[PDB]
Design a protein around this motif. Sequence first.
Motif, PDB file in Angstrom:
ATOM      1  N   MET B 119     -11.463 -43.731  67.026  1.00  0.00           N
ATOM      2  CA  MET B 119     -11.707 -42.549  66.154  1.00  0.00           C
ATOM      3  C   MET B 119     -11.498 -42.907  64.680  1.00  0.00           C
ATOM      4  N   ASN B 120     -12.359 -42.385  63.810  1.00  0.00           N
ATOM      5  CA  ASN B 120     -12.087 -42.183  62.360  1.00  0.00           C
ATOM      6  C   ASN B 120     -12.243 -40.692  62.093  1.00  0.00           C
ATOM      7  N   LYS B 121     -11.987 -40.245  60.864  1.00  0.00           N
ATOM      8  CA  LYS B 121     -11.973 -38.798  60.515  1.00  0.00           C
ATOM      9  C   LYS B 121     -13.338 -38.160  60.861  1.00  0.00           C
ATOM     10  N   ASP B 122     -14.403 -38.971  61.027  1.00  0.00           N
ATOM     11  CA  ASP B 122     -15.814 -38.508  61.158  1.00  0.00           C
ATOM     12  C   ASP B 122     -16.296 -38.440  62.620  1.00  0.00           C
ATOM     13  N   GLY B 123     -15.736 -39.235  63.548  1.00  0.00           N
ATOM     14  CA  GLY B 123     -16.200 -39.232  64.954  1.00  0.00           C
ATOM     15  C   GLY B 123     -15.491 -40.238  65.842  1.00  0.00           C
ATOM     16  N   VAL B 124     -16.015 -40.426  67.057  1.00  0.00           N
ATOM     17  CA  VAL B 124     -15.374 -41.218  68.138  1.00  0.00           C
ATOM     18  C   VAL B 124     -16.423 -42.124  68.793  1.00  0.00           C
ATOM     19  N   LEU B 125     -16.068 -43.390  69.032  1.00  0.00           N
ATOM     20  CA  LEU B 125     -16.879 -44.348  69.824  1.00  0.00           C
ATOM     21  C   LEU B 125     -16.925 -43.873  71.272  1.00  0.00           C
ATOM     22  N   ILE B 126     -18.080 -44.003  71.922  1.00  0.00           N
ATOM     23  CA  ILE B 126     -18.299 -43.666  73.361  1.00  0.00           C
ATOM     24  C   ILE B 126     -19.063 -44.816  74.006  1.00  0.00           C
ATOM     25  N   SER B 127     -19.112 -44.849  75.336  1.00  0.00           N
ATOM     26  CA  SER B 127     -19.953 -45.784  76.124  1.00  0.00           C
ATOM     27  C   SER B 127     -19.604 -47.236  75.742  1.00  0.00           C
ATOM     28  N   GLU B 128     -18.305 -47.546  75.739  1.00  0.00           N
ATOM     29  CA  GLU B 128     -17.728 -48.882  75.435  1.00  0.00           C
ATOM     30  C   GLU B 128     -18.108 -49.327  74.010  1.00  0.00           C
ATOM     31  N   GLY B 129     -18.303 -48.378  73.086  1.00  0.00           N
ATOM     32  CA  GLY B 129     -18.560 -48.646  71.659  1.00  0.00           C
ATOM     33  C   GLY B 129     -20.048 -48.740  71.314  1.00  0.00           C
ATOM     34  N   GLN B 130     -20.944 -48.586  72.291  1.00  0.00           N
ATOM     35  CA  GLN B 130     -22.417 -48.604  72.075  1.00  0.00           C
ATOM     36  C   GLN B 130     -22.827 -47.351  71.311  1.00  0.00           C
ATOM     37  N   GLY B 131     -22.200 -46.216  71.616  1.00  0.00           N
ATOM     38  CA  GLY B 131     -22.460 -44.922  70.961  1.00  0.00           C
ATOM     39  C   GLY B 131     -21.375 -44.552  69.965  1.00  0.00           C
ATOM     40  N   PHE B 132     -21.655 -43.566  69.115  1.00  0.00           N
ATOM     41  CA  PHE B 132     -20.681 -42.877  68.233  1.00  0.00           C
ATOM     42  C   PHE B 132     -21.073 -41.407  68.192  1.00  0.00           C
TER      43      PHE B 132
END
Lengths: 255, 262
Positions: B119-132
């Motif tokens: 996570m940063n203030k703007d969003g979260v990594l998903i799908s082992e970091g492939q998505g945000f």
Amino acid sequence: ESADLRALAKHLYDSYIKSFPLTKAKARAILTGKSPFVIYDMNSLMMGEDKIKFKKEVAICIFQGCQFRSVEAVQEITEYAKSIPGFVNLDLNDQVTLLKYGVHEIIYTMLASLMNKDGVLISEGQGFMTREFLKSLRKPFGDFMEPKFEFAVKFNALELDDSDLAIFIAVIILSGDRPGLLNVKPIEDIQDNLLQALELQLKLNHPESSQLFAKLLQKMTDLRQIVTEHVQLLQVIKKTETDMSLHPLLQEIYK
Amino acid sequence: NPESADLRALAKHLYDSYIKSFPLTKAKARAILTGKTTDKSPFVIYDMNSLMMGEDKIKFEVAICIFQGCQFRSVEAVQEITEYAKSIPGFVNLDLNDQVTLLKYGVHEIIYTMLASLMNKDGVLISEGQGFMTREFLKSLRKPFGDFMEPKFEFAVKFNALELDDSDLAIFIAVIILSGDRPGLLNVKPIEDIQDNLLQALELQLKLNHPESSQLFAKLLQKMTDLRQIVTEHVQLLQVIKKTETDMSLHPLLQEIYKDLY
């Protein structure tokens, strides 16, 4: 160069003592008698629970206790392995791959140290569960342990001590033929160093015991056969036994 | 000295295990987020179009699908933390009911500790970091689902400011698991002896790794207050969904972790 092998033999022996609380030397003293609570039947078992606090049907509860000990043994072996020269310097995926396939072989090797033809030491050698009482368990749990006992009798006849087993156990972990390995060379290179140390240890420690090294390597066959056979019994169990299902978290721990 | 050497040994052992138990580390997460690179670029989901095109790009009603996907990831994470827990010297030697109890209460505090890394203030990594998946998109979800992630984000922004690395986190999530104050614990004493030794290891790890960061140890311990709070909010939130969403199923492993929780 002949002294670099003795250093390695001693190093592994010292590491093997630290890592494994109940050793062959000790296990043998308890079994020969030079004292453990004995479990020969259902009444003795249920007193065993009572007078030995160790962490539904009996047969199922016994098999599951064997598993909880196996998970403990995995942590002892992991620690031991990290003391093997070169092992920590390997790719981390290879370290994990070597431990994944090697633990079952090492479990059943070391279990022989705790076994005679009459039964097995349990709970740090506080208990002794008879071969007969285990065979008496209702199928398919009856001949769960019978293959290990048959291996142990044959293995134990080589009269190996802790100093010999320390190097042998290292040789098993550094098997360059495990599926999925990424850099086989440094593994095989370490196993060759460990095989020299073992060869020399066995000539010095057992000068009258001809081709013991060769006999000990042949036991590799017996180990993998025992492991394939144990894995097959887990399939037969998982599928045909309903009362297995534990707490979902427990199922995660004891895979 | 030899006492310190043993604590560095334990620190190194836990780090090694941490790296083997968790595919997506904080070191990797930050390399993706601070987007320095050409190969590690995440696909960004900020709306409905972006989510639906994300189907083709990343391999895996809308608010439900996110929540159900976010559920299976929580389960995958419990499996990872369970594998890590086994590696903690002494953990598998404990009474087996206590082992289950330490995980029942431990895993959600750790899920949200490690989720901060993604996570940063703007969003979260998903799908082992492939998505945000952006904070705004998650907040724009239908009630009550709009409100699941916001408190985690609030925690993550504060927690990330401590600037912990994976070597620090390994010891810290060990300290969480070996918590003697869990409801229903049979043998509290052996757990405290382990946690005590872990806490000595963390104290040293933080002093050596972050020597210019005064009282980081104290400040880190105080964050275990904020984790409990997040877990509670989440549990209250599940109760509400259960009632308004009768046609939505929770995964048993999670149902079991929440069963008779606090």
